[PDB]
Amino acid sequence: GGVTTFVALYDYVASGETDLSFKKGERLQIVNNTEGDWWLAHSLTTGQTGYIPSNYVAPS
Amino acid sequence: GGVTTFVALYDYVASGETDLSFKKGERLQIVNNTEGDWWLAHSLTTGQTGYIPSNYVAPS
């Protein structure tokens, strides 16, 4: 059965606003683009990232 | 060429820690699983989400 969790091998310090910092030994999930009808999105105004309902958006 | 940016149609208030809040009219990117060797991850310890170098992790 597929793995549920990954562990960090090293410390990582983020340089941008889309990447994630973490400490060696930290426990992390690798996540999917989509969760049902929810898509992963990155807010250009608040710089944060997360899933959103795909029916709440339209192309520019 | 493909769309670069989406616009919010309504306000959304997040309920969990994997979902993203945004206001109507916010400009958002829908993001890809991977960017090169980098995968999207969700930190169970800090609750934050972001890209990480895939060579910095191992399965549990």
Curated annotation (Swiss-Prot), chains A, B:
Explain the post-translational modification.
Answer: The phosphorylated form is termed pp60c-src. S-nitrosylation is important for activation of its kinase activity.
Disulphide bridges, residue numbers: none
| Expression across tissues | Expressed to high levels, and with a high degree of kinase activity, in certain fully differentiated cells such as neurons, platelets and macrophages. Isoform 1 is widely expressed. Isoform 2 is expressed only in the muscle.
Q: Where in the cell is it found?
A: Cell membrane; Mitochondrion inner membrane; Endosome membrane; Nucleus
Question: In this protein, which residues make up the domain named SH3?
Answer: 1-60
Q: Which family does it belong to?
A: Belongs to the protein kinase superfamily. Tyr protein kinase family. SRC subfamily.
User: Subunit details for this protein?
Assistant: Forms a complex with polyoma virus middle T antigen. Interacts with AFAP-110. Interacts with GJA1 and PXN.
Q: What is this protein for, i.e. what is its function?
A: Non-receptor protein tyrosine kinase which is activated following engagement of many different classes of cellular receptors including immune response receptors, integrins and other adhesion receptors, receptor protein tyrosine kinases, G protein-coupled receptors as well as cytokine receptors. Participates in signaling pathways that control a diverse spectrum of biological activities including gene transcription, immune response, cell adhesion, cell cycle progression, apoptosis, migration, and transformation.
Q: What is this protein called?
A: Proto-oncogene tyrosine-protein kinase Src
What is the primary gene name for this protein? SRC
**Residues represented out of the complete protein:** 81 to 140 of 533
